[PDB]
């Protein structure tokens, strides 16, 4: 149906290249919490080449021309857009299957979220080399919604403690509930053939 | 004046090396300029005394 990729710990182009391949193959991919996407190289280097992007402005009127987006949901969405054939109708239809959300909205906060170990910083960056966060390089360029997102992030996660608190309570029960067995005739085939 | 306080002032203002290329104000036992603009060059002269 729809796959949900949590975006923290991921590199920008390593994640957006895989997402752009899946979206051409018919799937519907939703990249969620794209404030914490990383990008390799230190912060000042990634900050300079984004400011070099901002002055890519057409001279005669900048209203027509390059639309420099500032939220990191649209920083990511534009990176996917350059890895899709978007001037064709095959790639117009591709970018409609991608819905990228900054933060985690309530249709997608109670789903289970997936990661891509191809694009993780821990996997792919050597640990002694520097990386920049997509959140605060969005903050330094005109994205004015960092504080009101990170307030809603810690409101989301405190409610996400109280669910996981009572979910590990329930599996402490059904593992104490299976202490009193009375069913070992059914353990016989599973232990013999991988429980 | 206070000539012992005169020495302690000059330790941070005069007792240093200047590079001929990056013009930086380094420390009296530098061999190279620390600034990248000169390419860490090693032509130093002492900061000129009054």
């Amino acid at each position: 149906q729809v796959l949900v990729l949590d975006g923290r710990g991921h590199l920008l182009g390593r994640l957006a290249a895989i997402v752009a391949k899946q979206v051409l193959l018919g799937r519907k991919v939703v990249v969620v919490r794209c404030e914490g996407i990383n990008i390799s190289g230190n912060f000042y280097r990634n900050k300079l080449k984004y400011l070099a992007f901002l002055r890519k402005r057409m001279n005669t009127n900048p209203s027509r021309g390059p639309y420099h987006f500032r939220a990191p949901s649209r920083i990511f969405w534009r990176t996917v857009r350059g890895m899709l054939p978007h001037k064709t109708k095959r790639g117009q239809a591709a970018l409609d299957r991608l819905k990228v959300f900054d933060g985690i909205p309530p249709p997608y906060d109670k789903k289970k979220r997936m990661v891509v170990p191809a694009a993780l910083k821990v996997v792919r960056l050597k640990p002694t080399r520097k990386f920049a966060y997509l959140g605060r390089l969005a903050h330094e360029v005109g994205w004015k919604y960092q504080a009101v997102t990170a307030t809603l992030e810690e409101k989301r996660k405190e409610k996400a403690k109280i669910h996981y608190r009572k979910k590990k309570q329930l599996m402490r029960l059904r593992k104490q509930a299976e202490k009193n067995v009375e069913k070992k005739i059914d353990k016989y085939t599973e232990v013999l053939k991988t429980h | 004046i206070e000539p012992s306080l005169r020495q302690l002032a000059q330790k941070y203002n005069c007792d240093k090396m200047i590079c001929r290329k990056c013009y930086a104000r380094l420390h009296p036992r530098a061999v190279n300029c620390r600034k990248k603009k000169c390419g860490h060059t090693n032509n130093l002269r002492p900061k000129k005394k009054v």
């Binding site: 029960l173 509930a177 069913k183 005739i185 059914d186 353990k187 085939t189 599973e190 053939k193 991988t194 | -």
Partner: protein, 139 residues
């Protein structure tokens, strides 16, 4: 934090490659990413395997620094590495993982029926542990 090292005598498991799934005993490190290994009682002889292939276990052997095949063999079966590898929970997982892959179609029926059978018993009994816990807190 770094509780198992490489060492002369460290028993490594082999994950992939042409000898995938057989133990080796590390004999000598040669250079930085290649180790000279062999398993005399487990059908893999003396050669240089990469460290990226091998999986370190918690078994050590006291044999000299790069001895012959005989002296490694005497250290292997005195300490009884092949039977102590049977009584570990990591070889029970590779045993169980290959029991599930050779699980035939008729056994996949017999697994299915007794799997839904024991989940009825737990779900009706974990309901009874719910049914008592609310009865603790109602007084």
């Amino acid at each position: 934090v770094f509780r198992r090292f490489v060492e002369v005598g460290r028993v490594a498991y082999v994950s992939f490659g042409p000898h995938a799934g057989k133990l080796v005993a590390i004999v000598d490190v040669i250079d930085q990413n290649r180790a000279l290994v062999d398993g005399p009682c487990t059908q893999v002889r003396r050669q240089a395997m990469p460290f990226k292939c091998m999986q370190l276990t918690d078994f050590i052997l006291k044999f000299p620094h790069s001895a012959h095949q005989k002296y490694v063999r005497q250290a292997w079966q005195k300490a009884d590495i092949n039977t102590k590898w049977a009584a570990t929970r990591w070889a029970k997982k590779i045993e169980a993982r290959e029991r599930k892959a050779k699980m035939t179609d008729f056994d996949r029926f017999k697994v299915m029926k007794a799997k839904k059978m024991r989940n009825r018993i737990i779900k009706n009994e974990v309901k009874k542990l719910q049914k008592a816990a609310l009865l603790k807190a109602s007084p």
